[PDB]
């Protein structure tokens, strides 16, 4: 919650703006404390913030990184290990010759962005009328 974000907000934003697998993996390896639900939670809100402000292109960029972190955290729950100890295997898995894991990632990413677009619209009905 609260002051993890006061502490690391600029680092979370930076991660949110990466894209290449090796760039993300290096950044996390260098900043392992960011591999946590607090980070994924912040990225979700930020996506909704960007979408509402019509920064749709940037929302799509941040959404990619949001799903990266969610996948990492899910993988960890899968193996019952700490996500800080196993996050590199997300990148290994995504790069596998059979593109099955990557396909599921892409599907979750597209679905996530649809949900973000819906959530954004709700914020302006929230007090549109």
UniProtKB/Swiss-Prot annotation:
Role according to the record: Co-chaperone that binds to numerous kinases and promotes their interaction with the Hsp90 complex, resulting in stabilization and promotion of their activity. Inhibits HSP90AA1 ATPase activity.
Top-rank taxon, per record: Eukaryota
Cysteines joined through disulfide linkages: none
Protein name, as recorded: Hsp90 co-chaperone Cdc37
Residues bearing PTM N6-acetyllysine: 7
Summary of subunit composition and partner proteins: Probably forms a complex composed of chaperones HSP90 and HSP70, co-chaperones STIP1/HOP, CDC37, PPP5C, PTGES3/p23, TSC1 and client protein TSC2. Probably forms a complex composed of chaperones HSP90 and HSP70, co-chaperones CDC37, PPP5C, TSC1 and client protein TSC2, CDK4, AKT, RAF1 and NR3C1; this complex does not contain co-chaperones STIP1/HOP and PTGES3/p23. Forms a complex with Hsp90/HSP90AB1 and CDK6. Interacts with HSP90AA1. Interacts with AR, CDK4, CDK6 and EIF2AK1. Interacts with RB1. Interacts with KSR1. Interacts with FLCN, FNIP1 and FNIP2.
Region forming the signal peptide: none
Family membership: Belongs to the CDC37 family.
Residues of the full protein shown: 148 to 276 of 378
Subcellular localization, as worded in the UniProt entry: Cytoplasm
Processing after translation: Constitutively sumoylated by UBE2I.
Record gene name: CDC37
Transmembrane segments: none
């Amino acid at each position: 919650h609260k002051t993890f974000v006061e502490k690391y907000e600029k680092q979370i934003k930076h991660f949110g703006m990466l894209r290449r697998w090796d760039d993300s993996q290096k950044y996390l390896s260098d900043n392992v404390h960011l591999v946590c639900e607090e980070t994924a939670n912040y990225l979700v809100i930020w996506c909704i913030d960007l979408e509402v402000e019509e920064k749709c292109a940037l929302m799509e960029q941040v959404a990619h990184q949001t799903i990266v972190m969610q996948f990492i955290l899910e993988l960890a729950k899968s193996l019952k290990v700490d996500p800080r100890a196993c996050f590199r295997q997300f990148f290994t898995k995504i790069k596998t010759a059979d593109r099955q894991y990557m396909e599921g990632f892409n599907d979750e990413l597209e679905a996530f962005k649809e949900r973000v677009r819906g959530r954004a619209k709700l914020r302006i009905e929230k007090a549109m009328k």
